[PDB]
Each structure stands twice: as structure tokens, then as C-alpha cells.
Ligand binder design. Structure first.
Ligand SMILES: [N+]
Ligand SMILES: [N+]
Lengths: 405, 406
């Protein structure tokens, strides 16, 4: 069947508003975490986040942005970057049945769903709500808000699977190319950052709460003193393209998606089973004749979760384990956008021949014993890289990307 | 070239809590719409809804239901029925890497997103939120709350595409079968019914508001006096199974999914273009050389939308227009749960040989002249049926199902 490659990328994250700023941040191990007055004022215990530092005012036409929540805004900007980076013009991708879009968010828009209810409960009711809340809230906001202004005619929907969201979007995009249904599928996602949603995670005891005085050190994946994840917002989009179609137009090909694993734990609602991850990673490596050189781990900086993945990694590789780093230590956990942002961080490592450092590890965790956790920006000629995304509900996604031959 | 068939179904809707109650409603042209004091008290203009008439208390283990919003509950109850209907023992589908679940909702849980925020702003803060709001409020709630209790090991995620949601879930499940990745995929969706979400629709003018005194008359697809859809909730699940796997275990097969269209309008944010729908139905019909005997329309009872669909149907079928009925006039529009529920109503019509009536058409819209809109229950041997789901954001899905020989 058909092979799929990535021919363009775009990103708006806590560590950079485009691939150049993100590349700079990754090489220097710069943290995108800051103190959040909004979270403190809301009454939360976690006072830090991986916020997008960008004034998006006037970046999107009013008639388009009026329908959008922040998740869509971020994904929209990311898609604009990916389209340019791919060297694509309207004539090639708009009004074309063979071009699609699969992009989602993990939470939709808790901020606008709450704005809707607050406004409706006020004296103006429906008038205060306005006619734009359905497209801002609504789990498919990200796909709907982008497909329309970009004149997408092919496939159009959102997949959501919590933290694995945008990784499943990419994988489904790959399947569309393999099934011969689409020549190009823009795949990614976005996630707003707001106390409305962050508090649900804090109420769950899932967010870091001991490092509010030193934001940049709160996300500390693999560190013995990790106490939860730092929530983040952002967006990402990659252009997934059928190989012959890409070669035929002289596209710049970052890599081929040679493996995609999607499995389920069928065990715990919030913690990973590990058994699911093992199968997912193996499914993704199946048939890949080259070793994994780098693995961007799921590790969100939580006690059990970090340990569960490492064990799964040991089970899959043994002593032949790849270089490992958790960019989450610098970026925070962007939920729905995490899969595509991490697939991007990984393509930038594959593209620029380096491994970003897993920062804030002051004392490695006993579980990471027989594994190579890279903690300093390291130059290396990577060929095959893997990225794991494991979300609540026991849902797993692993993407394997390789330089083309 | 693997083929996908439906071997079990389950449903919780405004017109029945299982396929038997639903079958009766369909044949009787029975409305599931009722007056809603909750919508009225919330300040909405639309005071009618297609509510699930069932108290779900205690039907799900306390430790499982604690993570669930209503969409997940409806979907869970639906999947239990689907599993029993498919004759699948636990050993046949649990802890099995070749068995998956793709199910979603259009809105996740606006009720719980709002609850978490209201609680957080109150005197107990985090303590009032509780540790279960995430799995209730997240967009993948429906897949997450089911995959876990049912011990699903294969694919696990939700697709969300507004009104087309569960129809894309079914199509994606077919794709897993065709890719040879799964032997069985449970596909479906659920949607809660609450003023928190409903007012958003009312605020954009999408809901019927002129028939609150006669709730059963508010949903009237194709009627000249339609004035918006009637929101509903509920769930549905079908067992999508690879054909060889179904035949080997003696599965009862309702039909084969012989066509699946998924397209995008790339035009207007809330109005259909018609053009995408045309491509969607044509894509679903590719290589299907039997005629469409019955088409379950998307027609949600809106002025603009009902006609764009009729125009698309006219374009796709020309002279070979199939019999058509909008079960929506009876059920209301269940958003994320609609695609699977209408696929199920279509399968029931196919299994039992009848076409359910498109009720409440007191004055047929002029642009519907010449089509075969069925307005009275009609017995007829059906072989191939089509069901459309066209949602906001210009997202389209069409499913074509066909009876197998013997
Ligand atoms: N990752
Ligand atoms: N339908």
C-alpha cells in the first residue's frame, strides 16, 4: 500500500511560536513554564503553566476567528505555518477532495462552555450567550474551525483520546493515505490553557503543586522529586502526504511515518497499565528494519506514570534501549496538542541531528536504571525516532518516524 | 479487501431503551419528544427535547459509573446490549488486541465542565470539584469510560464531528477492519441532554421554538412550517466485525457496510453547502451496484438544511430517487449519538422489512416535490439502505448498508 511522509510542520507552544523558536528552545533546554496569576486567583494549588506567549490579536480574520476557541486559534496558526513550510498554495490544497484534515483537542473549550452557561444564567440569557458558542465549545471545534476557512474538501473530523489525541490524529491521517483515500491530510490539534479546565486536573491531584515559587523547575520528569505535571496549552499541525505525490512535487520530506501503534489498556481510568504501552510500541516498530535512535517519552512528570512507561520501555527494548528524553520537562503537558507537538520536537531532532535534554532531573529515579536518559543537548545523527502518547482511559498511541532513503 | 458486517446493536434513545422498544416506536411513528421544564427554566426559547426515559441509577457498577457523564452512561448501556446481541462472551472480546472501540460525543459533557467551574468558584474550591470531573468532561469521555470497564485492548479513541460523530466512528471502525488491524470494533456514541449545551444551540437560532405547546409536533423535517431542530440525548453502539470472523463463530449478521463516505464542505461554518453532501453520498455509493431502497436522511427539521439535503439527494440519484424518511421527526436530534442511532433504525428497517414514516409533514415543502418521502409506515423488502449525517463545521458522513445472501 501507500507510504506516508511529513512534508511540512507548524507549531505554537510554550517554548516557541514556530519551529525556529521551538528549535532554539529545545537546543538550549529552555523552559516554557511560568507563574500563572490566573491559576492562583482561581483557587488552584498548582500555580504554574506552559503558556503560549503570543499576542494573537489580528492574526486571524475576524469573520474566521469569531467562531474559534483558543484550541482552534492555536491549531489554525500552526496549520498556516505548516501549509507554507510544505510549499503548498491554495490551488493545490483548497477545494480538493483528496486533501483532508484530522485535528482535535482533549477538552474542547471548557472556557467557552463555561462562558456560555455563565452568560445564559445572567439577565440577558441567550442574547448574552451569542451565536458563536457552539463552534468554540463542541469537541470537534478544532477540525470544524480549520476545515471551513482552509476550504478542505476531503476528510474532516476530530479524534480525541486525551493526551494521545493529536498522535491518533496523525496516525489516522496515515491510514487515510494507506487506504488510498487522500493524497494529503493535515493532522494535529490544539488545546486552550485555562483555569476552567486546569482545575479539573488539580482536583484530581494530577498537577505539580510544590514548585510554585520556582516555575521552571515544576515539570521534572524522571526526577525523584516530581509531584505531578505542569499543564500547558498550544497547537501543532503536520502535513501528512502520500509519498509519490510528495516526490512528484519536489516537497521537502522531513520523514516517513513508518509505524503507528494504537492500543488500549482495558485496566485503569487514570494510571497506565504498561502492558498496553508495550503492545503499542511494538505495533509501531513492527516491520521497521532500523533501530530506534531516540524516543520522546510520554513521561508527564508523575510518580507512577513515569515509572510505568520506563518499565514498558525496558520490556520492549531490554538492554538495547534508545536515547530518551522527556521534553515535557521544559514544555509542560499540552494534553490534546501534546502528540503532534512531540512528533514535531522529534522531527526537529531528526532533522537537525540532535537530542534535546530531559531537564530538571536533580536526582534520577531508581526506575530509570538500565536506560539512557539524555540530560544534556546532544548532537547525534538520528535516523529513526519514536514518540509515545498515553492518555486517560488507558488509550495509547506511538508514532515511528524515519529519514527517507 | 476485508469486509465489515454489523453483528450486534444496542441503543438508548428517546423512542426506546432497546431495539425492541425502538422497533415498535418506528413502526408506530411514535414521537419521543416531550416538554422540558429544565430547558424552560434555564431561560431558553426552545422547551422541548428528545429525552431518554429511563432511570440509569444502579445499572452500572458504582466504581465504573463514578467516572462517567451521561453520554458515557448511554453509550455504556448501549454497548452492553450490543455485546449481548452479538453473542460475544467476555472471553471472546475482552483483553483481545484485535478488539477495539471507537465511540464519541459531539459535546463531551458541558454539564460537568460547567459543574467543575461552578464548584471551583464556590467556598470549597477544589474539594467541591472532586477527582472525577476530567473523565466526565473530556472529549474522549465516551471511549475512555467504556474501553476500560469492557477490557478493550485494541484501538481506543473517540471521533468527534458534531452531528456526524458516531457515523464517522462507524466508518472508522470499518477502516480498521479493512486495514486488517481489528477483527471487531465497537462503534457508536452518546450525548447528554442538558440546558448547558442546549442553550448554545438555542442562542444561534438552531432549535425549534414555536411548538412548545405541542412537543410531539415540533420536529417536522420537510414540513413547510419547520423551525429548527429538537435537541435529544442518548446513545447507540454497533458491533463492526470482519466478515470471516463473524461467519466462523456463527454470528447473526444484520448487514455489510458496503459504503462509507466522509467529506468536508470547506464552505460555511453552520450551513451545509450541499456540494460536500453530494460527494459524500457518491463516495459511499462507489462500487455499490444495487439500488438504494431506503435513505434515512440527515434532515434535522431546519429551513435551510432540510432542502440542501434534498437537493443533494436529487443530484446524486436523479431519476432513481429512493424511498426517504426522516426518523428525526420522531426522535429529535441526538447530535453525537445520531449517526449510530439512525444506522440502527436503518438496520431495523432492513432486518424487519419496513420503512418508518417521516411524521409531522402537514404541508410538504415545495422543494421536496417529486421525491419519495414516506409518511406512513410501509412494509417492503429492503436490501440496501443509506443513512446520512451532515454536521456543523461542514463535516459529512454517509453509510450504506446491505443485506447479505442467506
Ligand atoms: N512523546
Ligand atoms: N441519518
Amino acid at each position: 500500500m501507500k507510504r506516508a511522509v511529513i512534508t511540512g510542520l507548524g507549531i505554537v507552544s510554550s517554548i516557541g511560536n514556530n519551529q525556529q523558536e521551538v528549535l532554539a528552545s529545545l537546543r538550549e533546554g529552555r523552559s516554557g513554564i511560568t507563574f500563572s496569576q490566573e491559576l492562583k486567583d482561581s483557587g488552584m494549588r498548582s500555580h504554574v503553566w506552559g503558556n503560549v506567549k503570543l499576542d494573537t490579536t489580528g492574526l486571524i480574520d475576524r469573520k474566521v476567528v469569531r467562531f474559534m476557541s483558543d484550541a482552534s486559534i492555536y491549531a489554525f496558526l500552526s496549520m498556516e505555518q505548516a501549509i507554507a513550510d510544505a510549499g503548498l498554495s491554495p490551488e493545490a490544497y483548497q477545494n480538493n477532495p483528496r486533501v483532508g484534515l484530522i485535528a482535535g483537542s482533549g477538552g474542547g473549550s471548557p472556557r467557552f462552555q463555561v462562558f456560555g452557561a455563565d452568560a445564559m444564567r445572567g439577565p440577558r440569557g441567550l442574547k448574552a450567550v451569542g451565536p458563536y458558542v457552539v463552534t468554540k465549545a463542541m469537541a470537534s471545534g478544532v477540525s470544524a474551525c480549520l476545515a471551513t476557512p482552509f476550504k478542505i474538501h476531503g476528510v474532516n473530523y476530530s479524534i480525541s483520546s486525551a493526551c494521545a489525541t493529536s498522535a491518533h490524529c496523525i496516525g489516522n491521517a496515515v491510514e487515510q493515505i494507506q487506504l488510498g483515500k487522500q493524497d494529503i491530510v493535515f493532522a494535529g490539534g490544539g488545546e486552550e490553557l485555562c483555569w476552567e479546565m486546569a482545575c479539573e486536573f488539580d482536583a484530581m491531584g494530577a498537577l505539580s503543586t510544590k514548585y510554585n515559587d520556582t516555575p521552571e523547575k515544576a515539570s521534572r520528569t524522571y526526577d525523584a522529586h516530581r509531584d505531578g505535571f505542569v499543564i500547558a496549552g498550544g497547537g501543532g499541525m503536520v502535513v501528512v502526504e502520500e509519498l509519490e505525490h510528495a516526490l512528484a512535487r519536489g516537497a521537502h520530506i522531513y520523514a516517513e511515518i513508518v509505524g503507528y501503534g494504537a492500543t488500549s489498556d482495558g485496566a485503569d481510568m487514570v494510571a497506565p497499565s504498561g502492558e498496553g504501552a508495550v503492545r503499542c510500541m511494538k505495533m509501531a516498530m513492527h516491520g521497521v528494519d532500523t533501530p530506534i535512535d531516540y524516543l520522546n517519552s510520554h513521561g508527564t512528570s508523575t510518580p507512577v506514570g513515569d515509572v510505568k512507561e520506563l518499565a514498558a520501555i525496558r520490556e520492549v527494548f531490554g538492554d538495547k534501549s534508545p536515547a530518551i528524553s522527556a521534553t515535557r520537562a521544559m514544555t509542560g503537558h499540552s494534553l490534546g496538542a501534546a502528540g503532534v507537538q512531540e512528533a514535531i520536537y522529534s522531527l526537529l531532532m531528526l532533522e537537525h541531528g540532535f537530542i534535546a535534554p530531559s531537564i530538571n532531573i536533580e536526582e534520577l529515579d531508581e526506575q530509570a536504571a538500565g536506560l539512557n536518559i539524555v540530560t544534556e543537548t546532544t548532537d547525534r545523527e538520528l535516523t529513526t525516532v519514536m514518540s509515545n502518547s498515553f492518555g486517560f482511559g488507558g488509550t495509547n498511541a506511538t508514532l515511528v518516524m524515519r529519514k527517507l532513503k
